């Protein structure tokens, strides 16, 4: 059976976490819960750590407290088609192999499925460790709670002996690298100084051999992501964000500097040998936007290249990670601001950026947005019971599954039937513009063939390649973005019509060019 | 009423008989239930047939005695969408018609149905009879029951005065042989030699005008193509699959000579005229994977080219009915050991293999055939009764339908939602990677005009043709193969992959050369 | 927000609590989750009551840490 | 067998931590915990029937007790 420490004694040497534990809600809650530090209180000094104490990042060290928020979010929602590929007829995005030619996405891009998974999908999508890690077998992809009791009990390695990114199957890739990771688990929070920089203290790094990472990581999604586990205080434990907010000084609502003051980030810093090691963003509130854009954003979490001179930015160079906290209008000029893109189309030779699920982003200014909602409110609302004690569903997920609670308390104007309809314009009308997005963005790609083999100039391709980098950015956001619209209609619709013309201005560029050349 | 007839006079000459009839559970099944031999009895000698009995291949013949077996047969699965063309973005091969133009199944692929309509199904397709066939009226494509009785109950002949293939609507081909029709019926069963091989005593062989031979022909799949009637013993009676099995000694399961050997085939011949005629397959047990093999394999039954020459091989030649009994990876050595293709690719003009429906060969050497496990364990499971005599049930169909006897039983881990996952993570997978694979395929494909028109030298152009050999092999096994790889994932995932690879190698072979005539 | 008392300061006096309570699964359960005796701490002897502390009996005290069983037995 | 077992069964989950049921209830709301998964060999009709079987024939002679008793109280 577990027994207390004195926590007076760890206090002597950590100011810090007394400041934060002896005042929240944790004030009670033993550090034995998740700390064996025995060793650690014999040997440590006021500065040095001495021996190591061992810090569970397992989300059952909180679930013996917490079962039903545990529960809730280790569930599994079976009707989130698993290993779903987006780049197929009947899914997201029906022409993005000729449209992401070049970029590793092609390898494999899935719809998202259950948080349970994310850590374990991570491993094993095609696109991410050429093939190397694998379910045991396919029955294990089905359990959600053995996924969240460690990835390692239900992935193999191909090759425990090597640590370098290879392929193991044929048509894989090796995108991961170690800043993948920080969306995916936590378990790596004191092994990992701020942004993934160099740091004496860090046994992990931007520049670590990601296999060797990978191996060290077990749960998805920790707990402790949002809830400081010292004070149980609602906070963002993600450096990227932290960055974007506090270090950039660009506010939790960077289009509300009002909002961003009430619902704000306090950057707490904790060290090693005395220099900053790593940080923590208290929240104001317990905003989950703020908590869900941890990672439902664009970032870079890889390589690329200078837009200026195409030179390699390695994961050497903090852009490699990056929020650019910036909405589709204002990306091209962040992304212009570090001087970055992602890759060059195949066909097209244009630099390209890649977009990642920006759903914090398209969700600013949206009328929900504006009116003080929240992701919580209609992906993890509180539980409603006939008798019982309310707490927040954990379970993040589609409204759909809980229209009641998501939609109808505030909509009451509705039946389910009629919200699940307004979901459904927003989505299908959405869908069309990108699906017309790609026809053009496919048309004009199938043109830059036949225009370099017509003997059309560097400069007319070089327009289109312009062209086609907003083309590009103004569709893939919506691909890339998981609500098909609905977190932002107006703002969707504008981008991907603007897709659209960029797309038709490239492909009347091309084709008249073609059509020179050919009268010539 | 029946009257009994004295078998111990059909036994006097019908030794091969009494020795099945007299041991098996059909002991005590008078002849009459069967055959009206009365003329036959009064005109026969020990070895000339006199007068030709008649012999019932109606399954009503077995639903007299076996009503529940017959019952579940028939059914319907109104779910299993029926007329549904394979080449469509929400079915199984969006990009089929590009990637399989030149052969026959361009006419249309729809998706298989219920086994009561594989008689009428194969007659009325666009690309059996030059829609020579149709169902009576709209109405007709409902009676599963009345296709059973006889699919000239529901059909019609666009001209009973003509027996030449020929096209009666526009779209249409004529693809239909003789040979098609031993995995539709058996009611021919007497009347086609081993093989089809021409023989005195054959009214049918593979050389037959296939539209007098089809109005010969009534019954779906007759339940002694499983069932010996005499023995009431488990049996094939597919001669292509004895044929594999027996005569080229390949074993029931080619990778596994020890259950091989357990459940093996015993090679059975009758004679007319002291002449061998036909033959039929005894099983050591009632095991579904090799009967369920009669059909649900990859087969020539078709004329051809081969690969050596490109000479025609017609009907007439063996070949024209052929079992490979070979998995995808031993299919291509397979087609070079008897030195066969398909068709040649219109774009292309690679030589092309076409892939049908291997079921069984994929679910060799998988998880679950490596376990015992058998087709009918899926696919037609023992029905589960509070109160009631154990059957088994004859409705082959997705396991989707009865999960608890199809999967859970042996699932005891699982709920339905989490064994329905399992196969949706399989399938999504796969069919991701199948439509990667056509995307690849398609690429390589619009290559080939573009490359002989820049004058793309021969040499390179049957470079390529290679590669589309492999490319087409590798992906269209799986869109042939209905499981969409769940009955073997690695194997599928694997295959899928080196198709990627080899249109990619394609392309790029393309691609530069296309760029070097340019150049030049 | 619940402070924490000194749990071995009420186990000087406390010893057949304390024998249940240092061994059992609540050994990292401080007595202020169900008991107020800031007073009787005050107050007390090992051989004198002095002030009454309170203590909770109701079932939310033990809720906090186990609401999916609080929340089936409410039902 | 404990009441527990019938009336206050561990909940079953796909994915979750297991914890006891403290809704003390008949286990005709939870069949599957309270009776199936020792009793494999019925179904829950089965099992509801072989209850309800005890049941009327024990209230029969609830009721026969009872017209017994008011006869001779009468
Ligand atoms: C003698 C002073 C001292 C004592 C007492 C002490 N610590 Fe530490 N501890 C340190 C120092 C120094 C570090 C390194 C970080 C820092 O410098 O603040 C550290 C680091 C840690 C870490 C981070 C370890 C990592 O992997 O990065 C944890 C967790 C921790 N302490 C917990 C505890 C607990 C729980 C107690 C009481 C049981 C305790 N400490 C008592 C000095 C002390
Ligand atoms: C409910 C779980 C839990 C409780 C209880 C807990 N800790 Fe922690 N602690 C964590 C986790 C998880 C981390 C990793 C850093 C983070 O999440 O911010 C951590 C990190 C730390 C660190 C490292 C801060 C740094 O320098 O990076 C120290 C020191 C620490 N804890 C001390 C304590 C002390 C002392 C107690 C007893 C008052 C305690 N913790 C109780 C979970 C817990
Ligand atoms: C030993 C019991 C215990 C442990 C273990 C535990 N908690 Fe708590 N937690 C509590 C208690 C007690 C409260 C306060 C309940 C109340 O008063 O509302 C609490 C409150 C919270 C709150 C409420 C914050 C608020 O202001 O409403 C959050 C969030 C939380 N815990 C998260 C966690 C996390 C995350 C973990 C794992 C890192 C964890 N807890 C582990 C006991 C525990
Ligand atoms: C800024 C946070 C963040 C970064 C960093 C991150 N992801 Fe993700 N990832 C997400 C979110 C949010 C989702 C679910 C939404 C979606 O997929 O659109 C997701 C989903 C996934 C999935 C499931 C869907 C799919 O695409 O197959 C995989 C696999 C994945 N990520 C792999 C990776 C890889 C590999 C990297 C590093 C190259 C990476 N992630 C970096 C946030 C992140
Ligand atoms: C993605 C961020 C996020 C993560 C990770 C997270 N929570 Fe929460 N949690 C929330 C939000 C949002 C609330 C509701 C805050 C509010 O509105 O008061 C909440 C509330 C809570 C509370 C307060 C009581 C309640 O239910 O409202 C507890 C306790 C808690 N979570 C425990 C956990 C546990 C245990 C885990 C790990 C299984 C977890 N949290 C992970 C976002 C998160
Ligand atoms: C339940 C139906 C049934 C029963 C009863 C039955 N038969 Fe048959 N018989 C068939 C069918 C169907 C065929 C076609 C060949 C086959 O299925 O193997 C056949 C074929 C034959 C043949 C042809 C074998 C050959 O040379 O090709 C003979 C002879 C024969 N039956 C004799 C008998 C005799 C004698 C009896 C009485 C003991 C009998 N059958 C009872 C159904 C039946
Ligand atoms: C006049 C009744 C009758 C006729 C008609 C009939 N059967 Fe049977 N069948 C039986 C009987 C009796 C048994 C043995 C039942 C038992 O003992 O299990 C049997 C057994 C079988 C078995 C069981 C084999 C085994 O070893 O378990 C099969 C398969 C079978 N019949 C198929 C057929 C087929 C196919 C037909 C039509 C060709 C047919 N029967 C027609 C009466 C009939
Ligand atoms: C008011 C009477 C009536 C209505 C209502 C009706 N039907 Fe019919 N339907 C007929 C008749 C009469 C025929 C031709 C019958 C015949 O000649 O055998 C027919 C023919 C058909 C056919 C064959 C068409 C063809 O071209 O051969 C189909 C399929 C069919 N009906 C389906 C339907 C469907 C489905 C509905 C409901 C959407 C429907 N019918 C409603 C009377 C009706
Ligand atoms: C080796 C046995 C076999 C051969 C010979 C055979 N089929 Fe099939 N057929 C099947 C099986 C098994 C299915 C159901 C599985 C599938 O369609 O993928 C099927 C399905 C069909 C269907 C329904 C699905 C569709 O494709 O539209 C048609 C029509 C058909 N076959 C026609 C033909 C024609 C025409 C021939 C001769 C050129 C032929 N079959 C030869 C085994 C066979
Ligand atoms: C595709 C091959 C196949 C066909 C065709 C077939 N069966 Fe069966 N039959 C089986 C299999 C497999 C079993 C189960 C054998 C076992 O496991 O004992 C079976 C079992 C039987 C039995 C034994 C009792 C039972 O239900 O398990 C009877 C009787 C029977 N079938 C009758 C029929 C009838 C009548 C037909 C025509 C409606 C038919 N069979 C067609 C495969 C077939
Ligand atoms: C007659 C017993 C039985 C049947 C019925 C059965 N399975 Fe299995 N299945 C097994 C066994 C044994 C394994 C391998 C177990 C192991 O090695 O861990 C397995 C493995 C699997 C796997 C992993 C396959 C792989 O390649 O790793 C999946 C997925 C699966 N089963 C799903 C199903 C589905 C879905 C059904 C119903 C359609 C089903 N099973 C029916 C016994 C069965
Ligand atoms: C989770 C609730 C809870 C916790 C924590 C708790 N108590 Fe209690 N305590 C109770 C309840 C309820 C009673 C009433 C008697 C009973 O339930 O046995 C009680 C009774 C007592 C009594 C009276 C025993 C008697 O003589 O009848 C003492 C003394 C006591 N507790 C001391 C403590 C101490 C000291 C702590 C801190 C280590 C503590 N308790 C922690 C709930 C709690
Ligand atoms: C501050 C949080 C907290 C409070 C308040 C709390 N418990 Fe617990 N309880 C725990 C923890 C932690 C465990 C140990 C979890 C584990 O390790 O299995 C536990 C374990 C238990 C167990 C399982 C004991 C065993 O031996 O298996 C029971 C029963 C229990 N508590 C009852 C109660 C009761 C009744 C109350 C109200 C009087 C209460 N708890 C209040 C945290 C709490
Ligand atoms: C009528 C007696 C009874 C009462 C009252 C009761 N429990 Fe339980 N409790 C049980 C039983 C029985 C178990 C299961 C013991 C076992 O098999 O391990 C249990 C188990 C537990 C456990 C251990 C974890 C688990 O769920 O198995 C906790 C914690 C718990 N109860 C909390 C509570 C809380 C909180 C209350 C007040 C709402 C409560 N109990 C009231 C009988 C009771
Ligand atoms: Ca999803
Ligand atoms: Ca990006
Ligand atoms: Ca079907
Ligand atoms: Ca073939
Ligand atoms: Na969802
Ligand atoms: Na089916």
Redesign the interface.
Same mark, same amino acid.
Do not use: I
């Given at each position: 059976?577990? $027994?207390?420490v004195d926590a007076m004694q760890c206090f002597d040497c950590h100011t810090q976490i007394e400041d934060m534990h &002896?005042?929240?809600?944790h004030?009670?809650?033993?550090c034995? !819960?998740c700390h064996d530090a025995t060793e650690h209180v014999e040997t440590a000094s006021s500065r040095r750590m001495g021996e190591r104490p061992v810090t569970r990042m397992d989300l059952?060290a909180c679930? %013996?407290? !917490? %079962?039903?928020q545990?529960?809730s979010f280790?569930?599994?929602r !079976?009707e989130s !088609?698993? @290993?779903?590929?987006k =780049? %197929?007829? &009947?899914s997201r995005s029906?022409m993005f +192999? $000729?449209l992401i030619a070049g970029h590793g996405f092609a390898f494999?891009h =899935?719809e998202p499925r259950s948080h349970?998974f994310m850590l374990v999908d991570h491993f094993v999508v095609d696109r991410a460790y050429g093939g190397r890690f694998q379910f045991k077998?396919?029955?294990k992809? %089905? +359990?959600?709670?053995g996924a969240?009791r460690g990835a390692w009990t239900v992935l193999t390695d191909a090759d425990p002996e090597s640590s370098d990114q290879r392929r193991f199957?044929?048509?894989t890739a090796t995108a991961a690298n170690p800043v993948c990771l920080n969306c995916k688990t936590q378990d790596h929070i004191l092994d990992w100084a701020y942004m993934g920089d160099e740091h004496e203290a860090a046994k992990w790094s931007r520049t670590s051999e990601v296999v060797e990472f990978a191996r060290d990581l077990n749960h998805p999604l920790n707990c402790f992501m949002c809830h400081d586990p010292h004070s149980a205080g609602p906070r963002v434990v993600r450096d990227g964000l932290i960055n974007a907010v506090v270090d950039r000084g660009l506010g939790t609502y960077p289009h509300d500097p009002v909002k961003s003051e009430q619902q704000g980030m306090t950057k707490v810093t904790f060290q090693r040998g005395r220099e900053d090691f790593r940080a923590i963003g208290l929240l104001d509130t317990a905003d989950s936007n703020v908590m869900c854009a941890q990672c439902h954003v664009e970032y870079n979490c890889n390589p690329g290249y200078q837009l200026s001179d195409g030179s390699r930015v390695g994961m050497d160079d903090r852009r490699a990670n990056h929020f650019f906290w910036a909405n589709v209008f204002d990306y091209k000029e962040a992304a212009q601001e570090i001087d970055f893109f992602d890759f060059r189309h195949a066909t097209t030779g244009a630099a390209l950026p890649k977009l990642q699920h920006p759903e914090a982003e398209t969700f600013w200014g949206s009328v929900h947005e504006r009116n003080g909602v929240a992701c919580a409110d209609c992906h993890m609302p509180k539980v409603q019971?006939?008798?019982? $004690?309310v707490?927040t569903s954990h379970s993040q997920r589609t409204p759909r599954d809980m229209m009641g609670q998501a939609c109808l308390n505030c909509h009451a104007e509705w039946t389910e039937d009629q919200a699940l309809y307004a979901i459904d314009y927003i989505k299908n009308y959405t869908h069309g513009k990108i699906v017309k997005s790609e026809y053009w963005l496919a048309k004009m790609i199938d043109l830059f063939?036949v225009a $370099? @083999?017509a003997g059309v100039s560097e400069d007319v391709l070089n327009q289109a390649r312009e062209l086609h980098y907003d083309a590009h950015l103004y569709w893939e956001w919506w691909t890339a973005e998981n609500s098909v619209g609905f977190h932002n209609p107006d703002q969707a619709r504008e981008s991907l019509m603007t897709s659209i013309s960029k797309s038709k201005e490239a492909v009347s560029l091309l084709n008249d060019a073609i059509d020179a050349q050919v009268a010539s």
């Open positions: 059976n577990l $027994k207390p &002896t005042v929240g809600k004030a009670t809650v033993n034995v !819960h059952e679930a %013996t407290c !917490h %079962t039903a545990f529960n280790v569930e599994v !079976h !088609h698993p @290993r779903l590929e =780049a %197929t007829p &009947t029906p +192999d $000729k494999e =899935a349970a077998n396919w029955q992809v %089905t +359990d959600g709670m969240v199957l044929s048509q019971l006939e008798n019982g $004690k707490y063939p $370099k @083999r």
